Amino acid sequence: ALPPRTEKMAVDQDWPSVYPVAAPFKPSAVPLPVRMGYPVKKGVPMAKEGNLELLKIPNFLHLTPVAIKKHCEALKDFCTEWPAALDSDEKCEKHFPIEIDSTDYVSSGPSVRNPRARVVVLRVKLSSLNLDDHAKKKLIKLVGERYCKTTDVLTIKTDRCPLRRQNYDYAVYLLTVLYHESWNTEEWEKSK
Amino acid sequence: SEYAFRMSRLSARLFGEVTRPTNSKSMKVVKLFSELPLAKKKETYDWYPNHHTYAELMQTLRFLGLYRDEHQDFMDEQKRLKKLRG
Amino acid sequence: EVVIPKKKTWDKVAVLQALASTVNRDTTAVPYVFQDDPYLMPASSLESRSFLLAKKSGENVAKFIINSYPKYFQKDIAEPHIPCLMPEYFEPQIKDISEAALKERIELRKVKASVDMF
Amino acid sequence: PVVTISDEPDILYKRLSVLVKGHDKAVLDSYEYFAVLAAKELGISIKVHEPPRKIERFTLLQSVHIYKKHRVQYEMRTLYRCLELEHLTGSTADVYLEYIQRNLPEGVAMEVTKTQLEQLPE
Amino acid sequence: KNRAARVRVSKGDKPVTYEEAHAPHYIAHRKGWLSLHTGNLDGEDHAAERTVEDVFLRKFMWGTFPGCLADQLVLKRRGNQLEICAVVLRQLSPHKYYFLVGYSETLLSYFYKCPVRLHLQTVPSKVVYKYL
Amino acid sequence: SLWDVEFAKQLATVNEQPLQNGFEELIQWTKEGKLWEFPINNEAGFDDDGSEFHEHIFLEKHLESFPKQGPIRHFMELVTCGLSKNPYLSVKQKVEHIEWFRNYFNEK
Amino acid sequence: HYVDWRMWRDVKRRKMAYEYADERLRINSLRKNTILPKILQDVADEEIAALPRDSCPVRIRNRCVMTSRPRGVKRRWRLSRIVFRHLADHGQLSGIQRATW
RNA sequence: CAUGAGGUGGCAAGAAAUGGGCUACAUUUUCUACCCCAGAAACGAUAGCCCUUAUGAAAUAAGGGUCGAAGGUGGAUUUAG
Numbered sequence A: 001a002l003p004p005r006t007e008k009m010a011v012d013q014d015w016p017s018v019y020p021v022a023a024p025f026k027p028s029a030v031p032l033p034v035r036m037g038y039p040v041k042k043g044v045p046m047a048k049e050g051n052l053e054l055l056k057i058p059n060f061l062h063l064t065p066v067a068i069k070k071h072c073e074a075l076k077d078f079c080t081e082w083p084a085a086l087d088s089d090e091k092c093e094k095h096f097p098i099e100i101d102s103t104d105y106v107s108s109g110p111s112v113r114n115p116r117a118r119v120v121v122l123r124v125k126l127s128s129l130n131l132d133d134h135a136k137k138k139l140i141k142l143v144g145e146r147y148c149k150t151t152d153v154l155t156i157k158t159d160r161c162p163l164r165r166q167n168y169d170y171a172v173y174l175l176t177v178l179y180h181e182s183w184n185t186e187e188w189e190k191s192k
Numbered sequence B: 001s002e003y004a005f006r007m008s009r010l011s012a013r014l015f016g017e018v019t020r021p022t023n024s025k026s027m028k029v030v031k032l033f034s035e036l037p038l039a040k041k042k043e044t045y046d047w048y049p050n051h052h053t054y055a056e057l058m059q060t061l062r063f064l065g066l067y068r069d070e071h072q073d074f075m076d077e078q079k080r081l082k083k084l085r086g
Numbered sequence C: 001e002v003v004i005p006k007k008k009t010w011d012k013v014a015v016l017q018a019l020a021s022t023v024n025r026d027t028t029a030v031p032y033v034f035q036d037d038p039y040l041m042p043a044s045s046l047e048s049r050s051f052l053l054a055k056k057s058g059e060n061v062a063k064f065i066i067n068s069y070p071k072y073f074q075k076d077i078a079e080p081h082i083p084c085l086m087p088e089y090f091e092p093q094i095k096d097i098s099e100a101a102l103k104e105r106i107e108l109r110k111v112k113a114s115v116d117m118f
Numbered sequence D: 001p002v003v004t005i006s007d008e009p010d011i012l013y014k015r016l017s018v019l020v021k022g023h024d025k026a027v028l029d030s031y032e033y034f035a036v037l038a039a040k041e042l043g044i045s046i047k048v049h050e051p052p053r054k055i056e057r058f059t060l061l062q063s064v065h066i067y068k069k070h071r072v073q074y075e076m077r078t079l080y081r082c083l084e085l086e087h088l089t090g091s092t093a094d095v096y097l098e099y100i101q102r103n104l105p106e107g108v109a110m111e112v113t114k115t116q117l118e119q120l121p122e
Numbered sequence E: 001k002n003r004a005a006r007v008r009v010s011k012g013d014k015p016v017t018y019e020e021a022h023a024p025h026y027i028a029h030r031k032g033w034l035s036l037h038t039g040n041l042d043g044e045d046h047a048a049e050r051t052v053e054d055v056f057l058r059k060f061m062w063g064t065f066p067g068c069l070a071d072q073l074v075l076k077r078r079g080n081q082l083e084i085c086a087v088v089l090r091q092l093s094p095h096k097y098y099f100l101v102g103y104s105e106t107l108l109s110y111f112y113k114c115p116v117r118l119h120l121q122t123v124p125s126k127v128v129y130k131y132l
Numbered sequence F: 001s002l003w004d005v006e007f008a009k010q011l012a013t014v015n016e017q018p019l020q021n022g023f024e025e026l027i028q029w030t031k032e033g034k035l036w037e038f039p040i041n042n043e044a045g046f047d048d049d050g051s052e053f054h055e056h057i058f059l060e061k062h063l064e065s066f067p068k069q070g071p072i073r074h075f076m077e078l079v080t081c082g083l084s085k086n087p088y089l090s091v092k093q094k095v096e097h098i099e100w101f102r103n104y105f106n107e108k
Numbered sequence G: 001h002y003v004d005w006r007m008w009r010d011v012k013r014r015k016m017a018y019e020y021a022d023e024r025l026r027i028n029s030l031r032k033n034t035i036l037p038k039i040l041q042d043v044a045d046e047e048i049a050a051l052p053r054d055s056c057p058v059r060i061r062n063r064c065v066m067t068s069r070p071r072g073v074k075r076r077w078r079l080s081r082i083v084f085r086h087l088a089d090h091g092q093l094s095g096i097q098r099a100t101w
Numbered sequence H: 001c002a003u004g005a006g007g008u009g010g011c012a013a014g015a016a017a018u019g020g021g022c023u024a025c026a027u028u029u030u031c032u033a034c035c036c037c038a039g040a041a042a043c044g045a046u047a048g049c050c051c052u053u054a055u056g057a058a059a060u061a062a063g064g065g066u067c068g069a070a071g072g073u074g075g076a077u078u079u080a081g
Helices: A052-056 A065-075 A089-095 A134-142 A164-183 B002-015 B024-034 B052-064 B070-085 C014-022 C045-068 C099-107 C111-117 D025-042 D090-102 E024-031 E047-064 E094-112 F002-014 F022-032 F071-085 F091-107 G005-019 G022-031 G038-050 G081-090
Strands: A099-102 A104-106 A120-125 A153-158 C006-008 D005-009 D013-022 D054-061 D071-085 D111-117 E074-078 E081-085 E116-119 G096-098
Touching: A052 E074, A065 C014, A065 D025, A065 D090, A099 A164, A099 D111, A104 D111, A120 A164, A134 A164, A134 B002, A153 A164, A164 B002, B024 F071, B024 G022, B052 E047, C006 D090, C014 D090, C014 F022, C045 E094, C099 C111, D013 D025, D013 D090, D025 D071, D025 D090, D054 G081, D090 D111, E024 G081, E024 G096, E047 E074, E047 E094, E081 E094, E094 E116, F071 F091, F091 G022, G022 G038
Parallel strands: E081 E116
Antiparallel strands: A099 A120, A120 A153, C006 D005, D013 D071, D013 D111, D054 D071, D071 G096, E074 E081
16 A cells, blocks of 8 residues: 555645545545544544445535635636616516416436426416406406415416426416407306 | 306316316316326336346356356356256 | 626536636646555556556456447436447448448448458 | 627526425535525525425334234435525526536435526516 | 344454444434435435346446455445445455456446446455454 | 548547546536536427427317317317327327327228 | 246236237227217227237236335335335435334 | 146135124214204114216226114123223
8 A cells, every 4th residue: 555645735735626526535535534433332433544434424525615715716707697676576576577487306317307397387466467457357257266365476387298498388378368368358248 | 157157168278178068977088198097107117127138237247257146156056066966 | 777688608518617727736636537545546657557558448348348238238218318328339230232231331340341242 | 718698688587496305404404504605605695494304104014924013114304405595697597506406415415496587478 | 033234243253344233223323324316205206226226236346346345335326427436455456456447337337327436445454343 | 521530530539638637527428428418407308399389289280170069079179188188298199199099980 | 037937927017018008098088988879889898808918907016126026015116025124224225214203 | 748837717605613803782872054052863784785986808995875684881701001
């Protein structure tokens, strides 16, 4: 063997240079005598050089606060900033009415096929749509099962088509054709 | 009433389910065509590992000598003694 | 007025390039191709070259055995499809005397086979 | 450092909420401190929340052949940490979510990221 | 008596490590897990083939690293990086170690269709936690 | 042809360098396609030939209307709604299933 | 090269049911709709009765992924009781604890 | 040439006895509304038979109809807290 780099290294060295990647422990690389385990009755926690449990630990050594700081000095390029849309929820609702739900479910393995990850659902405000009176009456009568009374939120779900973008298309299509059929006056409305 | 039934029909036509009034004994059919069957399930047809690639690849790689399987070594020695005396 | 900015677009590579710029080279650590065990440490350039040729040897070891037995690796689980993880076929699948067979053998670089069926 | 300012205005993610869910509270809150420090020097308001853990418990027989009265009970400790996020850009979402899912931990991790992109009606 | 994963006491001369010294009721009170895959967490679908791949890899590693793996393996699985961490002894020749490292590397790469990384740790002798 | 692809191979060999870092290991894994496309959308690839939201659920153009007052047409409405509610089958399997019904009904 | 002839018979059931899966769905919908005349369903009754009796998913038994054991299998890993006990007690499977509460 | 392998069809019925559960033999009960301030009675099969439904290639389960058993708080002994 060789006298290891654990005592070859000295102070004032760059741990982002030492550990770039998420890696298992490697106690020879680690300059820290980490002791793991339930000790024996007249003994110490067992040593550093051969610890299966220290290799089993998720090992957040590669992410130290100076590594976050320098790394995001590198990442500070990849960002713009927000406009003055304000922290106010009514302000951002006025600026941008509709709210669409489209998420992802990240697994870990060979395949990235989580089908439920295509679920999409749209919430819109009638007080921000602003253009429905007997159209809003007809609208509620169309979608009875949604639109709870306490908050003026319309929630339309789609899980009918495999792709997330055409699920978004289904959502916006239902919004516009519910709107158009609500504004389409029918001949049997008066005999209510 | 009749207005409620035709609002249900209009909502059905607008959303994509069955428009005309139809009972549960064909809503079973529309749900059957709405789902995959229990035989097309990925877990159903990939429940078992096929075991041929596994067992035959290990047979080949041991006989290559890049794999050492102690179970097969044990039966090899045992069957050598069996052909020796039996 | 909303000053909504236009989204700057990248590849899958520039973030990791900025990561390399974050991790410049370690003046106390060896090249990362070798392992980090002191026993597995090559002491000389000849030992490092021997270890590297052993690694390349083992790489084409499994290349030979996998191209010899492609039936045991046809089951793809990874999505999307990875042709460079898919094993390569070196035997001519076109058996009749044809120009398609000539092109197949030319692509497979079988010189005597191509000459013989020409 | 390639940038490529291309063409079209932002997709405007409000409330990207990250549900980080595992077997290990120390992994969860170390990842919490990591992500909170990261978003702190990024300049984005990150908030913390602790949804209550769920334990999936079930029972198996202990002996091979007989003795139903003596059973081994096993359990799964499934522990939620909600890291809800508001007021962050689409490109910033790409870069922050990029680094978060790259330094995601091992089998003690899942992360369900809920994006609320706003947009305009049509 | 419970005979699940408890090595018995013979008379005091039996070298034994932390792993197989500790009993299954200390499974994460003291021990932890040897394989970290997110399949067994409450919402996931593929945990069954995760487990059959786990047992395949453990038996494959025991059979292709003959008589050098000290105790059992660390099988981690993050994203599509499968990581095989080994605790292998220092008794064979390092060209042979690197040969089998590359061999296992790309065999598991073409079998599991993912980046598989062998991370080795060499130890002089089988570590002893207590004597039973 | 052969000379330009062989020149590409030779250029790759003479600009092929040792890995020297784990981030560069991830770099070459991204370049080859070993590592996942990142960030994930749970939908790497999986185009379904640009079906785009009407082929999946609006099946009149493949319905090919019979006398619509018929029980055959009502059954076709039921099957069309079921195939619309299918997210797992694609439009190709949906239509092939539809003309299987058309073929069998023409046989009877 | 299998666990046993029963598990080979079962994987034959799995494969050949998976490939004779579509037409069984089609005319089983033609069973359990009430739209068609009874004799026009009867002709279908004879053709499903003539469809082979090893592709009907009523013969599908969820045996263990590791060793053939019919009853005593947990579906989430396709593992039998004591093989799951084996793996979870050596701790080669994450997240499972001993349930003390 | 078998004690191995495959296909098709049957095997799981009580002159009887016994272990363990479930429901009861009602008035602190039963039916109804309510989910505990009322009204009315003044009992008990999750068994048998019929119809329909669920699932299934091919019924076991569910609901309804029908019926209105034995049963009058159980000896010696014994269980659990």
